[PDB]
Design a protein around this ligand. Sequence first.
Ligand code: ADP
Ligand code: ADP
Ligand code: ADP
Lengths: 96, 101, 105
Amino acid sequence: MKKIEAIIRPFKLDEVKIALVNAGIVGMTVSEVRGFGREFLQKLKLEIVVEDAQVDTVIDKIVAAARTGEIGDGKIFVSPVDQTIRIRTGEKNADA
Amino acid sequence: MKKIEAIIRPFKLDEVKIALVNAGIVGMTVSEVRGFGRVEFLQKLKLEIVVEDAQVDTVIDKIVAAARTGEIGDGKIFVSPVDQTIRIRTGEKNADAISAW
Amino acid sequence: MKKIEAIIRPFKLDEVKIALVNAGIVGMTVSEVRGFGRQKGYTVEFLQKLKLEIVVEDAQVDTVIDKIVAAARTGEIGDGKIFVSPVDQTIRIRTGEKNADAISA
Ligand SMILES: Nc1ncnc2c1ncn2[C@@H]1O[C@H](COP(=O)(O)OP(=O)(O)O)[C@@H](O)[C@H]1O
Ligand SMILES: Nc1ncnc2c1ncn2[C@@H]1O[C@H](COP(=O)(O)OP(=O)(O)O)[C@@H](O)[C@H]1O
Ligand SMILES: Nc1ncnc2c1ncn2[C@@H]1O[C@H](COP(=O)(O)OP(=O)(O)O)[C@@H](O)[C@H]1O
């Protein structure tokens, strides 16, 4: 259980997002943030919780989607997730 | 220390909050996000509550109890490790930093 | 790699930022959040707060924390919190750099 967090350029969202649904990723959460700096630029923060096996793959897509041509495209941080539970049912881990 | 991140339906916020206060949770942090889970993005709330390991499950059980509706889209909860938690005002650490009597 | 997350008072941003610029921090990401604690202000529900996310090497963690605390503290209720969480990987989109290469200049 890993959390991939990709801060990217706003307009790239759609492009990236579509790729992710084609990767078999069920869900993600997008927030709007400001980034610094090269003073603060409008950027999107993508949070996707996936299985350990898919991390690199997902990453490889995100970067592929988020690349442009100039400095400031974004960053990607992978963090551990200890537990994931679904609210409607109460399922845990892989079921969620 | 553990970090509970609950993506829930917006209107449920208040209810959840009450549960947490009745759970003895003093504080939390809420941000606005858009989510999709089975264009397709829905307005949802993100609650961030840092608790003690021992308190994790109970808190979860409360959150789920409050944020549940029974319909698809209720949201999810992720527990992640936090290596340090410090209160800025005092300099307190761990349980002291997120509890106040 | 470690992720320092500092939820602070809005107006303190600049100030903390200055510390970080003096700390040798190249970049950071700030989001706007609502918070709940002891401080309030019907009566104020959730209060406007800033969320800072900085990914650094473990060695730089304490120093940065000590800087942030030095800058964002007031002595009154509502100053905020700081949580450090582990980060297993950090990647730059442009090149594909990993770890220390992706967040340092
Ligand atoms: N893999 C994921 N990573 C992060 N957030 C997710 C993920 N999957 C779903 N979510 C969040 O959950 C919400 C929808 O939950 P959903 O999957 O519909 O729950 P359920 O299956 O119980 O209906 C979305 O708005 C999204 O914010
Ligand atoms: N320490 C950090 N933690 C999280 N995000 C960062 C950090 N440093 C830079 N970033 C992200 O990188 C984006 C822009 O990169 P910047 O640091 O301005 O120069 P460069 O594009 O050369 O990396 C910013 O939006 C910011 O959110
Ligand atoms: N468990 C928690 N998780 C996340 N953020 C918290 C938590 N407890 C408090 N906070 C943050 O602290 C702010 C106010 O809390 P408060 O009790 O005034 O802290 P302090 O006692 O350090 O002044 C809120 O805006 C909230 O974002």
